[model samples]
Target: NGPVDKGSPFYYDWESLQLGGLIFGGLLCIAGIALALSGKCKCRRNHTPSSLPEKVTPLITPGSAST
Candidate 1:
């Protein structure tokens, strides 16, 4: 009576609850992954210019080291 009946004092419908929760959670997880991927792509695009150093070679070279 308690487990099956809707009007019971302690009614519990495990089927609908578990299926609904799992479906909702899976959708949210997929959405989160998509957002993460797109966000990372945008971040990489913005960071590309900043990644290059202004000076490639130092003032002191191999010859200076020899002296």
Candidate 2:
């Protein structure tokens, strides 16, 4: 091990860093899988379909037509 080269390639000489990435990536993959199978959650953001129409389609009764 000549001076532990930490150049040319990133983390090429860091075993601990590599192992950490393995653990982190595995957890992320596991979480990703759960998210794939399970739809949503109990703590999802409060959302409700708007009980309203986008707009009253401009009631085009030539008499009531005005911008």
Candidate 3:
């Protein structure tokens, strides 16, 4: 009955895999950006207010521990 016509589901296998990859990669990108941004956001949110820092200190040097 069908020889030349493969129908739509025939394409779903290839397209679905492609869609999965794109969605996974997109989610990873979004998650990574959010993860990185969260660090900066938390630092700013928790930082003491009312004054700005006059100087920035290097937290670590070589192999020595900071704080």
Candidate 4:
């Protein structure tokens, strides 16, 4: 056997870098899915439908006749 290569013995392997990218990308994907499916508990508590207007037309129709 011989200790020779195309460049030198200290050449960096690209496979390791690509593996790191895979882990990082997978983590981000998981986090995005979790956030979409189940939002933060505190934020969700403040987002009740009762807090927002259901229909602006009915809510703003205090006067039936046109002024």
Candidate 5:
């Protein structure tokens, strides 16, 4: 006579669940590295000059397209 009944829903196996978690974690790590290397994960202008902000703002201002 165990504390849990022989035919109860509470009794479930966790071996497969543990294996699934490990696999998911591995895939997440690989994807994170790939995104970092590709520069698609973060917006960064690595080669642009510091004065780029001054030059780009006028082109994007509202109603400036008619000029």
Candidate 6:
């Protein structure tokens, strides 16, 4: 509630905050790059057919089927 004096120990310094922000930002960037390179951020694609008829195929008939 009082004027912040330069001699006070509770003064907020911009340099310290800037340094902290830079460190945190660098760490976040590294983590993001690692995730991207590791395929953790890849989107799922439709490689297989969605319909049952299109997806399923008859490999053998009932009469002469050999397992």
All candidates' TM-scores?
0.35, 0.30, 0.36, 0.33, 0.33, 0.32
Model 4 residue runs over 4 Å out of place are 1-8, 30-39, 48-67
Which candidate tops TM-score?
Answer: 3
Where does candidate 2 have its weakest 10-residue lDDT segment? Answer: 47-56
lDDT of 3 at 34: 88
lDDT of 6 by residue, 9-60 (tens): 6666656778888898998999998887666334324233444334344533
Give one digit per residue, the lDDT tens place, for model 1 in 8-59. Answer: 6445655777889889899999999998897787766664453433233343
Better of 1 and 2 by lDDT: 1
In order, the Cα lDDT scores of the candidates are 0.65, 0.58, 0.63, 0.65, 0.67, 0.60
Separate clash counts for every candidate? 0, 0, 0, 0, 0, 0
| lDDT, residue 41, model 2 | 48
Q: Which TM-score value belongs to model 3?
A: 0.36
- Misplaced by over 4 Å in model 6 are 1-14, 40-67
Q: Which ten residues in a row are the worst by lDDT in model 3? A: 52-61
Better of 1 and 5 by lDDT: 5
The full ranking of all candidates by TM-score, starting with the best, is 3, 1, 5, 4, 6, 2
What RMSD does each model have against the real structure? 9.2, 10.5, 8.4, 8.2, 9.7, 12.4
Better of 2 and 5 by TM-score: 5
Leading candidate by lDDT:
5
